[PDB]
Amino acid sequence: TNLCPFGEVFNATRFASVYAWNRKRISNCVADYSVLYNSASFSTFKCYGVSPTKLNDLCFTNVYADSFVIRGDEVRQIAPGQTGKIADYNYKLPDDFTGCVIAWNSNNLDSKVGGNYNYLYRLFRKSNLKPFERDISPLQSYGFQPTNGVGYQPYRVVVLSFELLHAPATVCGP
Amino acid sequence: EIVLTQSPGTLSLSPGERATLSCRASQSVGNIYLAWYQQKPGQAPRLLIYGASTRATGIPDRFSGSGSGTDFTLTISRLEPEDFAVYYCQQYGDSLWTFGQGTKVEIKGQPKANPTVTLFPPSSEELQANKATLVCLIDNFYPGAVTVAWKADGSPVKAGVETTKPSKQSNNKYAASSYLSLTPEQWKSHRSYSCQVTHEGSTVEKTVAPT
């Protein structure tokens, strides 16, 4: 088949907010993962369970590219067993996560003069989320100015999840 | 932010020949963060390339864009009569968004052509109206790099001299004309007025006089 529409996800004409993150499914296509891990346009590329170079060998039933937009310093929150506002009340990865987290600076794309507030996050919640949960019921705006420091600038992020079903495999590498 | 500097400024080539334009950036931009444009005289511009290496909807394959980082290229492999225009690179990477200065793809397959030089004194009508303008015409020449000098008697006039820039023709030679605005007093108190031209060597001269 054709290439898996990684392009469409990894770079869409602007992304969605973190609290109401995007849950895009990728199936029935040939997936070259080298196109991704060979690129130096990322300031973050971490993997869990499996090595990203080995994925060209491997087949999966489905592949889910969860994507969102967060602040700066919080990129390390996007991980298993982590703590913080985002890992608690917005987006949480499981302790036994089998996938890869990729992020990059988007100050040029998602900051405005006087601030770009249309990006939000959940501040208050009575308890913490379960792995891969989204609440959509209170909240707080980020407010990205281009004049900010590295830690306070917007970072678009995508997380790949590889599904291991006892069902026909549709997403394989070269 | 970012400053853009194309090169060269002008490119004199023939229908059939190959034409390549570079575009230099002050800061880095990824591959998929650049576009190229064409502008024919007296028209809204036209998109050619986007994402540095993606052709626009229905662009011929003779047009090909490329490059990376801060150095980018646009190649027209088989120039046509329609490929004459000003060509602008334009970066989309960071904010602000910026445009390049613009490079003129000039049509040379023409040899060195000396201009026809003709001269016209003020209309008696204009003189009655208390003003005196002289017109010195230079047309059908190549290339568009030229100079003109005015003479009150045997002495050069300095101010009141405004000239129309290289107005390119359909036969792709050029045309330019100079205006000299004076008073009726000054026009009448000098025995003769001259117009000197130097185009690629030869210094030609023409003359008029109040009879």
Author numbering:
A (entry chain A): 333 to 469, 491 to 527
B (entry chain L): 1 to 27, 27A, 28 to 210
Direct quotes from the study:
Here we determine the diversity, potency, breadth and structural insights of bNAbs derived from memory B cells of BNT162b2-vaccinee after homogeneous Omicron BA.1 breakthrough infection. The infection activates diverse memory B cell clonotypes for generating potent class I/II and III bNAbs with new epitopes mapped to the receptor-binding domain (RBD). The top eight bNAbs neutralize wildtype and BA.1 potently but display divergent IgH/IgL sequences and neuralization profiles against other variants of concern (VOCs). Structural analysis consistently revealed diverse modes of bNAb action due to their distinct binding footprints on viral RBD or spike proteins.
The structures revealed that both antibodies interacted with RBM residues mostly outside the ACE2-binding site (left). RBD binding of P1D9 involved CDR L1, CDR L3, CDR H2 and CDR H3, with its footprint shifted upward on the RBD backside compared to P2D9, which used CDR L3, CDR H2 and CDR H3 (left). The binding residues of P2D9 included G92, D93, S94 in CDR L3, S52 and N58 in CDR H2, and N99, Y100 and V101 in CDR H3, interacting with RBD residues including G339, N343, T345, R346, N439, N440 and K444. Clearly, the RBD binding epitope of P1D9 overlapped with that of P2D9, but they were not identical (right). In contrast, the potency of P2D9 was not affected by F486V alone, similar to some class III antibodies (e.g. LY-CoV1404 and S309), and therefore could more potently neutralize BA.4/5 compared with P1D9. Aligned structures indicated that viral G339D and N440K mutations could form new hydrogen bonds with V101 in CDR H3 and G92 in CDR L3 of P2D9 (bottom), contributing to its neutralization potency against Omicron variants. The heavy chain of P2D9 might be pushed upward in the context of mutant RBDs, which might explain its relatively reduced neutralization activities against BA.2, BA.2.12.1 and BA.4/5. S371F and T376A mutations in BA.2 and BA.4/5 sub-lineages could shift the position of N343 glycan nearby, and therefore, conferred partial P2D9 resistance.
